Amino acid sequence: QPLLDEFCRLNELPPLILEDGNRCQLLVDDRFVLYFTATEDDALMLSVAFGGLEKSGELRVRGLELLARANYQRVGSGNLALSLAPNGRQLVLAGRQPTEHLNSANLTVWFHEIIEQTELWQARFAMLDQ
Amino acid sequence: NTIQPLLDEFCRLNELPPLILEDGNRCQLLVDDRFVLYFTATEDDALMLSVAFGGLEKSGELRVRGLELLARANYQRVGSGNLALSLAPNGRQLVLAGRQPTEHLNSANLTVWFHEIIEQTELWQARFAMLDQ
Amino acid sequence: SPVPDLEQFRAIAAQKDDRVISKRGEVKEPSTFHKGHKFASVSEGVLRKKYTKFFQENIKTHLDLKQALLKEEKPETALLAYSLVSPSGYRGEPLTERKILEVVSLLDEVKVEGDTYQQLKNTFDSISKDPRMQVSLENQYPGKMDGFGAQLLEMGKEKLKGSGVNAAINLALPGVGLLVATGRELHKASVNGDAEAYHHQLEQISQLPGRDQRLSMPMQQTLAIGHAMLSAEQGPMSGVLPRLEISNVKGDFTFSMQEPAAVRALMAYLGPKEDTSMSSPQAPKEAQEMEAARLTLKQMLGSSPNEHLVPDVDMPSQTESTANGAFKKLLSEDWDWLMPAVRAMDKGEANKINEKLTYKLPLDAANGRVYLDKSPNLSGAQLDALDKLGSPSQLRLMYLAEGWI
């Protein structure tokens, strides 16, 4: 369960100790918070909130339209998906993978992919205004 | 033709009619005489379970209601987490779809997946057919 | 002296809320200073350290923007444009591409003529002290200052003895009480898809002769598309409006007129008729200042001191309610009828609205010309109610486009 220690030691990443509810967090480029949560189903769910949606108006509708059709494509491995938080404004990108098929070199591929995809959706949702 | 042995055992294990890929790509299954489940053998060695159901309105408060439902639907997903609700390219039909690499799949975990997409389809379909209750 | 000049701020200016920082002579997004990604582990020591680290550059970036402005323009011009971001900047709030776009757009306006925006800012500074405006913001901003106006109502001379402002406060406590109750408590994202297209017509109406564009068009643009049209992306000029700098018992806040909720809060706060208690010469000089500044913006949007506008049922005078329904009839039946009807009323020719707005479609005929016409078919009672309105206030038309009356 703390097998990530090879993954962080592999890529020079600060420690990941899952405490007080087996949750561990990482900070990406001072802007995003990555969440390494352990499913009770022997899976590793990566989730990162990456921005906000407009509270009202046509800007919210255009973002709502963008969110619904975005999950139709394969956005990412581990069935990565776009979602809106219960607060009604935070955009959440989350996906999960079973730990048994998760070593360290494959984590790095899944780790960079969520980062690269998190960057892309932060930009497209901030580029709605046109 | 790669998941075909897995599909064969999965069908035999669940007393299901045989699912044969029509030239090694896609095949469909009529579930409970109610909706159709699609087995898509993509090119990148994965299995895609996908259901298409219902339909949002062309515009108006009801469409935005379904959009709000679509946005919240994929947050902290239950069970496997190998499913995602989305809107079809036609802008109306809803799609419940997930994909897994074939290496991750055995006959046992496929049966668990197959049962979740069914119970999720019946749930979301009823939920979206009763938007304005 | 590795300070970025104004051109590097103009380059990053965009209608986006992405944080930028000034560092090593350039200003851009913090991630773009390094080719790779950088990572950190959260913990009680680092989040308090990371926050101090962010707070310290938001201020440094604001001051580098201020320094860049001061180098390129006269200090009076540069500091007027910088005032938009100064109070929020001092609190560690982040400088974003939209704020820079606002500041740079504002600077391009006050460069040529600064008296217009200086009038607006002084007016906005006065209404920022008004509790009525402040509770109105609370209505549009759930979470920011809940219970400010309500728990403000339980006060008197013992709690607030003062003839500098606390005399002005007490005089507004009735208006506060009316203003907290009215509305949906949040109002609403009252749009039908057409409410975006309605505010497009108000834009044209704002450009009619004798009608204000400096205040109304940025407000109408924000309600339609979510933000105003800024200069760098009378007349609308820069499209930048002053900030609502709110300081009260609940905290220190800054509200951008580019936020729809802020426009709606100002809108409701400008509706009611002149509160003669605060406008009284015998009244506290502060109360005089807040009410006079409120009637100034109200009059800018065509709303006379006599005009009383409150969100109701979708109270208005008998001629008002019939006029509002005539406006709704024009809006729902055609796309280009409201503007010519408002124009006819502006000229006192409201009785000619039916014939003026008539569309004539010639058929093929003989012995003369046969036409097919479409007319608004406003009843005689509706034409009279419109004529009784004189020049309809842009504020009332703005209330209608939002579905408030």
XYZ file of C-alpha atoms in Angstrom, chain A residues 41 43 45 53 60-61 64-65 67-74 78-88 92 94-98 101, chain B residues 44 63-64 67-68 70-72 74-91 95 97-100 103-104 113:
68
model
C -11.359 -1.887 -3.755
C -7.281 0.514 -6.576
C -7.586 6.809 -7.516
C -16.873 26.987 -13.439
C -21.782 28.136 -17.055
C -23.874 26.557 -19.824
C -21.492 22.467 -18.739
C -21.739 21.595 -22.433
C -17.844 18.973 -19.539
C -20.597 16.612 -20.708
C -19.143 15.904 -24.158
C -15.530 15.759 -22.928
C -16.076 12.497 -21.035
C -17.336 10.846 -24.238
C -13.791 10.571 -25.573
C -11.060 8.578 -23.888
C -7.796 4.469 -15.664
C -11.128 5.775 -16.992
C -10.089 9.341 -16.181
C -13.165 11.562 -16.081
C -14.204 15.200 -15.790
C -16.667 16.166 -13.076
C -18.174 19.024 -11.079
C -17.797 19.132 -7.299
C -20.799 19.204 -4.939
C -20.150 22.911 -4.323
C -21.294 23.395 -7.925
C -12.490 17.752 -10.778
C -10.233 11.895 -11.440
C -9.336 8.359 -12.458
C -8.332 5.122 -10.798
C -6.292 1.981 -11.464
C -6.157 -1.362 -9.627
C -1.527 -3.785 -12.230
C -5.180 -0.451 -28.235
C -31.371 20.636 -21.032
C -29.293 22.681 -18.581
C -26.079 19.193 -18.101
C -25.840 19.918 -14.372
C -23.932 15.167 -16.295
C -21.304 17.385 -14.663
C -21.878 16.072 -11.129
C -18.677 11.525 -12.621
C -17.448 12.952 -9.292
C -16.045 10.318 -6.905
C -17.497 7.348 -8.738
C -18.719 4.280 -6.855
C -17.648 0.671 -7.285
C -15.043 -0.035 -9.935
C -14.791 3.558 -11.102
C -14.392 2.184 -14.636
C -17.447 4.037 -15.978
C -18.149 7.616 -17.014
C -21.419 9.292 -17.963
C -21.180 11.506 -21.032
C -23.181 13.177 -23.788
C -23.192 11.682 -27.277
C -21.761 13.663 -30.223
C -25.337 14.334 -31.362
C -25.673 16.565 -28.281
C -23.722 7.461 -23.022
C -19.117 3.906 -21.162
C -15.922 2.506 -19.713
C -12.792 0.901 -21.093
C -10.166 -1.379 -19.556
C -4.525 -7.497 -19.476
C -6.503 -6.179 -16.495
C -17.924 -4.851 -14.542
